Design a protein around this ligand. Structure first.
Ligand SMILES: CC(C)(C)OC(=O)N[C@@H](Cc1ccccc1)[C@@H](O)CN[C@@H](Cc1ccccc1)C(=O)N[C@@H](CCC(=O)O)C(=O)N[C@@H](Cc1ccccc1)C(N)=O
Lengths: 99, 99
């Protein structure tokens, strides 16, 4: 679909058997999700945003369905205020910016 | 133009007589620029991102040229790591996400 930006570009994602709402964020290199139930191994990692840094658990090759489109990639889980879908997954579903 | 997301969506903006590079950020409600020389009056404000909160200065009805498209709106100036063009200005240049 084509999404305009008058409202936050929130979409429905399915990950780890669960349904959640997430923000399509072109300004994020990574995908960061609020604390959640994910199976598998994971390695520590620190990331930065406006505000400072947070520590997150890095999960690789995680299946995620974004607005019906499937993608497999790195997902980070930590103290983020909102679920953020970053460029690592946005490219996977062929998402572009247009004006 | 159409912008893919394999690389950060960095564009040239002209604001306050100066040329700068900024990130098109669909995940930002506001436009936040690194410390810069801007004329006029401004109000204090606090904003949050992933990481925490920063104090910035709020300038209204400021003229900004984004990739050649002009727009007038609120711009915030503070301790941000990168210049961020948020939805308040992205809607003005008719920018949309597509997939
Ligand atoms: C997510 C991560 C992988 C860590 O990348 C970034 O932080 N990327 C940021 C760009 C960047 C690149 C390189 C280095 C540094 C920063 C930006 O795209 C992040 N987009 C969202 C991510 C986010 C949203 C919500 C919560 C936490 C984090 C954002 O900060 N949005 C801010 C942008 C600044 C602004 O608009 O003022 C925003 O809209 N903040 C709102 C909403 C809000 C309220 C309270 C807390 C947090 C957020 C606000 N008015 O404060």
């Amino acid at each position: 679909p084509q999404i305009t930006l008058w409202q936050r570009p929130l979409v429905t994602i399915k990950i780890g058997g669960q349904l959640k709402e997430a923000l399509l964020d072109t300004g994020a290199d990574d995908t960061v999700l609020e604390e959640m139930s994910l199976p598998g191994r994971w390695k520590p990692k620190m990331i930065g945003g406006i505000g400072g840094f947070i520590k997150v658990r890095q999960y690789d090759q995680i299946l995620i369905e974004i607005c019906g489109h499937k993608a497999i990639g790195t997902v980070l889980v930590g103290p983020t205020p909102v679920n953020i879908i970053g460029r690592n997954l946005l490219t996977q579903i062929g998402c572009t910016l247009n004006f």
